[PDB]
Design a protein around this motif. Sequence first.
Motif, short mmCIF file in Angstrom:
data_model
loop_
_atom_site.label_atom_id
_atom_site.label_comp_id
_atom_site.label_asym_id
_atom_site.label_seq_id
_atom_site.Cartn_x
_atom_site.Cartn_y
_atom_site.Cartn_z
N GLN A 110 -2.31 5.98 -0.44
CA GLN A 110 -3.52 5.26 -0.13
C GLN A 110 -3.79 5.20 1.37
O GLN A 110 -4.92 5.33 1.83
CB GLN A 110 -3.44 3.79 -0.66
N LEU B 290 -10.90 -1.25 3.73
CA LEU B 290 -11.08 -0.70 2.39
C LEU B 290 -9.77 -0.55 1.65
O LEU B 290 -9.71 -0.06 0.53
CB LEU B 290 -11.66 0.70 2.59
N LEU B 291 -8.67 -0.93 2.23
CA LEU B 291 -7.41 -0.82 1.49
C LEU B 291 -7.34 -1.96 0.43
O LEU B 291 -7.82 -3.08 0.63
CB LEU B 291 -6.22 -1.18 2.43
N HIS B 292 -6.68 -1.71 -0.68
CA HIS B 292 -6.46 -2.73 -1.71
C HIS B 292 -4.98 -2.71 -2.14
O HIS B 292 -4.32 -1.67 -2.20
CB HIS B 292 -7.29 -2.38 -2.90
N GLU C 34 -5.27 8.26 2.47
CA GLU C 34 -6.61 8.56 1.95
C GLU C 34 -7.61 7.57 2.44
O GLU C 34 -8.75 7.72 2.04
CB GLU C 34 -6.71 8.50 0.41
N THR C 35 -7.22 6.55 3.19
CA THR C 35 -8.25 5.53 3.51
C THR C 35 -8.54 5.50 5.01
O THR C 35 -7.60 5.47 5.79
CB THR C 35 -7.67 4.15 3.01
N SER C 36 -9.81 5.53 5.44
CA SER C 36 -10.06 5.60 6.90
C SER C 36 -10.26 4.29 7.60
O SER C 36 -10.36 4.26 8.81
CB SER C 36 -11.38 6.37 7.09
N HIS C 37 -10.42 3.20 6.90
CA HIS C 37 -10.64 1.92 7.54
C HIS C 37 -9.79 0.87 6.80
O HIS C 37 -9.73 0.78 5.58
CB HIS C 37 -12.09 1.47 7.40
N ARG C 38 -9.11 0.05 7.56
CA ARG C 38 -8.27 -0.94 6.94
C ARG C 38 -8.98 -1.85 5.95
O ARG C 38 -8.37 -2.38 5.01
CB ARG C 38 -7.56 -1.79 8.03
N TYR D 141 0.83 -1.20 0.00
CA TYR D 141 0.00 0.00 0.00
C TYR D 141 0.85 1.23 0.00
O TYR D 141 1.75 1.33 0.84
CB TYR D 141 -0.76 0.06 1.37
#
Lengths: 409, 1011
Positions: free
Chosen positions: A352, A361-363, A355-359, A348
Motif C-alpha cells: 500500500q 489516502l492511506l487506510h 501504491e499510495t502517493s499521499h498520506r 499499512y
Amino acid sequence: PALTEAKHQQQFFQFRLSGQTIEVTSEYLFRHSDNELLHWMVALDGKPLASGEVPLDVAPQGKQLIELPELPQPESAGQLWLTVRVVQPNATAWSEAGHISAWQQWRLAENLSVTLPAASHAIPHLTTSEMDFCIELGNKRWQFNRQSGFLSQMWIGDKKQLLTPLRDQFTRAPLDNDIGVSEATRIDPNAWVERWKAAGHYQAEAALLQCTADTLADAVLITTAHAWQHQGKTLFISRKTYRIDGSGQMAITVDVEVASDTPHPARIGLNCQLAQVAERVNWLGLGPQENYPDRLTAACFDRWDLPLSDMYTPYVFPSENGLRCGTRELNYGPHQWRGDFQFNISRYSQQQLMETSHRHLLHAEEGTWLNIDGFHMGIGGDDSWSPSVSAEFQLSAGRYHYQLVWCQK
Amino acid sequence: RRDWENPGVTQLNRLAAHPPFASWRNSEEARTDRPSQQLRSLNGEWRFAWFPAPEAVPESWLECDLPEADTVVVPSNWQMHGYDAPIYTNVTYPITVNPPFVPTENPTGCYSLTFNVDESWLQEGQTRIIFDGVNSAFHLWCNGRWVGYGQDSRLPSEFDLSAFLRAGENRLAVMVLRWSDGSYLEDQDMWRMSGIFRDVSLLHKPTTQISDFHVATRFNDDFSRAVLEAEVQMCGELRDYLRVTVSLWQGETQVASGTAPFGGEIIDERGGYADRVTLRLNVENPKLWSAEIPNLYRAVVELHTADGTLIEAEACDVGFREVRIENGLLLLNGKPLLIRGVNRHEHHPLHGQVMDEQTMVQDILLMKQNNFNAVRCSHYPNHPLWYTLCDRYGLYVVDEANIETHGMVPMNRLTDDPRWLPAMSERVTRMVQRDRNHPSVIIWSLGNESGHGANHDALYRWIKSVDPSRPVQYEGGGADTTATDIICPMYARVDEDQPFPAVPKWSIKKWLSLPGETRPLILCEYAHAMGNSLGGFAKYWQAFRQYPRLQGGFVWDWVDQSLIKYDENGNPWSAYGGDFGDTPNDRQFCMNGLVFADRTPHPALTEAKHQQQFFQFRLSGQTIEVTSEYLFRHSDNELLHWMVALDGKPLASGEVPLDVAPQGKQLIELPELPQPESAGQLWLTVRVVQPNATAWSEAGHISAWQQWRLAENLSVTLPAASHAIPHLTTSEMDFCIELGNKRWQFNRQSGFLSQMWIGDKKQLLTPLRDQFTRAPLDNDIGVSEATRIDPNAWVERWKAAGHYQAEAALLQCTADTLADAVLITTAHAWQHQGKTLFISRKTYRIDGSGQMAITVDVEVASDTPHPARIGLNCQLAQVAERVNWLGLGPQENYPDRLTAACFDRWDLPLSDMYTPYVFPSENGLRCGTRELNYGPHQWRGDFQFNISRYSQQQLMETSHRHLLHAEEGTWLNIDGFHMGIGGDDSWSPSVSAEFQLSAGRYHYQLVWCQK
Ligand SMILES: [Mg+2]
Ligand SMILES: [Mg+2]
Ligand SMILES: [Mg+2]
Ligand SMILES: [Mg+2]
Ligand SMILES: [Mg+2]
Ligand SMILES: [Mg+2]
Ligand code: NA
Ligand code: NA
Ligand code: NA
Ligand code: NA
Ligand code: NA
Ligand code: NA
Ligand code: NA
C-alpha cells in the motif's frame, strides 16, 4: 525523525570514555558551560543499575574530566550500557528548564550468558499430512504448508495469529531518495527503484526447492529452501530452519544468497500480517524514534515503549518508514521476537505504501504488518536526484545470515 | 691528537669534492664512457690487522707489514670477516652518549697495501688516491709518511699523493676507527659496521685540469627548446691559450657544441672568475628524460689549448628534465609526478654494506618490474654506480645527506647547535658537489631523524642558492618545517590522525589543507613492510590517485637487513639483531623489506606491484575502459589479454592491442560472451602484457591486471537421493557415526570431532577445535618485549585477556537421528579467570552422501579485545604434495592485503603455502576461498585458510625460521573470519577498524567431504 539526528550530530559537547573516566570537551567558542549539568546512567539490557549527576564547568574549547564511581557488578548476564546527557537546569530565552542539549552512549562490560536453559516440561508433536507439517505444543499450533514452504498459520488456543504467511521480503516501498527524479513518463534507469524494478525484485516469486520435517529429542525441526526468480535468473535463495521446542519457542535461522550481478537489495528480512492489533509496541533496541542504518546515531539503546501509531512516520509522500535498528527484543500483543534485527510495525503494508502517493489516502489494513529485517539498506540523502547511499550501507555481501526466536509472552 | 673526538676536525689535507672524474686523454673514450688509463682500481687483496684501540697499534706498522696481519679482500666491512661483531641497534646509540667522545675501547682496523705506480704518473701531473667509503674515520700514511685524515663514512675522501710516491712499489697504511665524532651523525637504523667498504682508486690528473663542472638544462614553455649550460672550473696554469669545448651527443651524433676561453662574467667590484667559463648550447626539441623514458645525451668536457691540444677530458650522461614545484604540485617536465617509491639501504647478507654492480642491477630490475619509479637513498649518499644505473634504467632519486642523530634527546640537540654546523655542512655540501649532474637525482634531502635545528635551515638555504634546479626536503621536526619544500612525513596514515605533541602525524588528506598550507605531500616513509605486513596498502594508493597534491611516497623498505650465519653443520641461516652477541640490540626491527636479503620476494611485493600499476580500468557492460597513468609515453609495448572463466573453468579469452596516449583512455568492447546455464560465478580477468623485451624486463612481462565478477548463476539444483542413511552408535564417552566406508567419532566429554576414518585409515592427529588466536605477527607485537611489555600492543591485549590460554568448557553435546542424517549439536564457552570470552555453537549434519555440513555461530564478549581470527583447526594425519583451491591466490593474502590476489583455481606444492618470514608468525593465509582440496579431503564454503607442517603454537614459540621443524601430518587452519595484519607502522596498533573482528556475533559454514 531526521531532526533528532541533526540535533545529536550538531551537539556542542563531545565526549570520550576511558575507564571510569568521561572526558567532556566544549565546542563553544565564547561561553562557559554555565547552564549545564551532566546526568549519567548505567543499565543492564534496559534495567537501570545506577545513575547520578555532576555539574559541568567547562571553559569554551576546554575539557573537564569526570570520574564515575565504582561500578558494582551486575547480577545477571547482559550488556551494560552507559548513557550520558547534558541537561540545562535553567530556562533561557529559547528553551525550558530541563532541556537536554546533548547525549552519548557506550557499551561497558558484557557478561555472555552460559547458562543452559532447563529441561522442557513437554515435547512438541509433529503431525504430517500431504499438504502440511503441523506442530502442536500445549495450546499452541504452527502450520507449515508443504507446497509453499512457509509458516502459513499459528494458533494460540483456537485463535489464528496470522492474516498472511511469514515470507521473506527483499524489497521496500521506495523512499524519495530511491526514486530520485524517475517518473513513469520518464524513467531514470540509474535510480535505485528502477534498478530494482528492472531486475524483477518487485515481481520475483518464491519457488520451493525443499521443505522437510524431522523430529529431534526435544523438538521438531522444519527445513526449507526457496529460490526467487525473474526471467529465468535466480535473484535470491533463502534457506531456513525452524526449530520448535518444549518451551514453545520457535528459533528461526535464515541464510540467504544474493546473486552478485543483481542490484543490491533494499532489505533481507521476513514479513507477515499479524491478525491482531495491539495498543503498544515495546522493544529493547535503538530508539525511540525511527532510525535507519545510515541514520541511527541519535537513537539510543534502551527499553522503549510507544503507542503503535508512533511506530509509523507520516511522510506526506509515503514510503518505507518507522524502522528501528539494533533491536534485541520486540514485544507486541502476546508475541515476542528476540535476535539482533531491524523492524517496522504498522497498519499499512509495503504494497500500500508504494501504491499510495499521499498520506491522507492511506487506510489501516486489517491486523498489523510486521517487517523484521536481518539487514536493511541505508536511506542515503546526500542528494535526492542521484543514488546517494554510501557503499558501506549497500547490501552487497552476497551471503547473509540472521536468526530470530519467536515465542509467546 | 684525538681528531676522532673533535667535530671541529672532519678531515685534514683532503681535496675538494667534485663530480665523477676519470681524466681521459682521448675525447672519444670520454664520449663512449670507456675505461680510462688514468683511473685505476686499487680494489683486491690487502693486508689487515685488528686492534682494540688505536693506542694498541704499533709504530712499526707504518713502515712495514705486520707478520700477523691477514690478507683480506677490500672493499669489505671487517665484521663480515669475523674480526668483531656487527651491532644492530635502531634508535639508541651503539656508544655512550657523551659528545664528542667515543669509547676508549674502539676497534681499529689497520689496512695496508703494497702497490705499483708507473714512473710516467710521477713525471708530470698529479696522482691522488680516492677512498669512496671508509667507516667511520681514518688516518692515511703513504710510504711511512702521514698524508691526512677523513670523516663521513658515505662520501669519497681524496688525497694528493704526488709528493709521497715513488716509481715502482709503494705502500699505503690506513688506520680506520670504528667510532669517531662522526658516529654522532651516523645513527641510522641499520647494522653498525666499519672498514674500507667502498672502492679505492688512483687517479692521475694533469697539473692544469678540470677541477669541477656543473651541467644545467633550462627549457621554454613547452619543452620544445632547451639551453644546456655547463660551468667549468680549472685549477693550475691559467693562460690565454686555454679553452674549454663542451659538446653534446645523442648516440654517435653530435648535436651541439661550444668553445670559449676562460674568464667568466664580471660578478662583483673585484671582477669575475678568471679560472671559470660557462658554455651555453642551444638544443632544439630535446629528447626528455624521465623514469618512464630515460633518454640521455652525453656531454664531453674538453680542456685544451686553442690550437688543438687536448689536455684532458671529463664527461657525464645528461638527462634533459626540469623539476619544479608550482601551485602546490611537484612537476617533472611540466607534469605532476606520482611517486611509486621505495627506501633502499645498501645491504647484502654476505658482504654487509659493500655494494656491487650485480646486486644493484638486480635491485633496479626487480624495482622496475614491480612498478616502482623512485628510490630514496635512506639515509646517506650511495655508492657512485647507483646514480649511473638510475640515470640509465630510469628511476627518480632522492639523494640524502649522511646525517641522522635519532638517539639524541631531544632529537635536534646537535642539529640546533652551531658547533655542529661545520660537520653537518660538509655532509650536505660535499654530497651536492658530487651528485649534482645526475639527472636521476630530482630532490635533495638534508638527512633523517635529526629533529629540526637551525643548522637545517641554514643548509636548506645553502642548497637552494647553489642548486636551484631541485627541491629540498627534510622530515625532521614535524615534516612540514621551514626546512622542507615538500610535506614529507613518515608513517602518517591516510584517514587517521595521530596528534602527538609538537610533531603530530596528521591524516595525509587533512595535512594538505591545514590553514595556510600549500605544499605537495610525498611520504618519505610509509607502509612499514616488516614481516607479514602491507595491510592497508591500497588505502594509500586510492588517496594518492584521488588528491592531486598527494603525490605518493616511498615504502619502508626494499630489502630485509638480515645477515647470514652458519650452524654447526655449516648450513647458512638468516640472523637479525642480537644474533652476534650484540647488545643492547633491536632484534628483528632490522628486517622490514619487500624482499628477503637474497632478493627473493616477500608476498607483500605483489600487492605493491598491483597498487602501483600504470593503467587503471573500469568495466561497463562488456566495455573495458583503460586509462593510462604514464605522463610522457604512449603504450607502445603493451597489449591487453582478457579471459573469462566459470569458477576457474576457462570459457573464452582474447588479446587486444593497447594504444593509449599518456593520461589518455581507450575503450575496448569485448566479444559476445558465453552464458552457460551451468551454475557458478563468471569472472573476467584482464592483464597488460609487454610483448617485447626492454632493458629492464623480458618479453611477455605482465605489468598490470584487474578482475571483475560478471554474471553469477546461483545453484538451485537439488542433489539426488542417497541410497543410504548414516548410523549412530552411542556410549557415555562418544557419539560414533558410520556411513559406508566412512566413520566419525565425537567425544562427549570434550564436545569435539576427535577422529574420522576413510576406509579404515584415521584422518586426524588432533581433534577439530575452534581457534580464536594467531601466532602473532610483527605488527601484533610492535615494540613489546618480555622485559618491557607494551600493554597497548595487540599481542599483549590478547595475552592479558587470556585468549591464548582460555579453555573450552562444554555446555552441550547432543546427537539426533534424522530422516537421512545424523545431527550432532554442541556449544562451548571459552573462559578466563571467570570471564566468558567467546561462545561457539555448532551443528554437524552427516548425511547419506557422506558429507558433513558444519554450521558455526560464535559470540564474542564486546568488552574483550577483538580476536585475531574466528575459525577451526586440526592436525590432519596426511601429508600430501599439493594444495588446490578455488579462491584468492596464488600468493599469501590477508583481508587488508588481498587486492593483488585473483580468484581462480590455484594448485601449488605444499611448501608454497608457507611463507618463510625470518621471524616466524601466522602466515600463508589465502582468503575468499570457496573450495579447498588436500589429499582426499575437500572443504567447501566461503572462508580463509592456511595449511602447513607448522602449528600456530610452534610458530609463536620459535624466534627464527631455521629452527622450525615439520610436525607429523599437516596443520590446517580454516577461518570464517581473520583480522587484518596492519602495517601503517610496526610499533603501534595499525589494523584499521573495518578489519577488526568487532561484530560481536559471527556465522560461518563449511562442508567437509571426500573424493
Ligand atoms: Mg553514539
Ligand atoms: Mg673529528
Ligand atoms: Mg673535437
Ligand atoms: Mg716526460
Ligand atoms: Mg632512525
Ligand atoms: Mg581488484
Ligand atoms: Na554548569
Ligand atoms: Na509511496
Ligand atoms: Na595525487
Ligand atoms: Na633490545
Ligand atoms: Na628498521
Ligand atoms: Na601497444
Ligand atoms: Na614467532
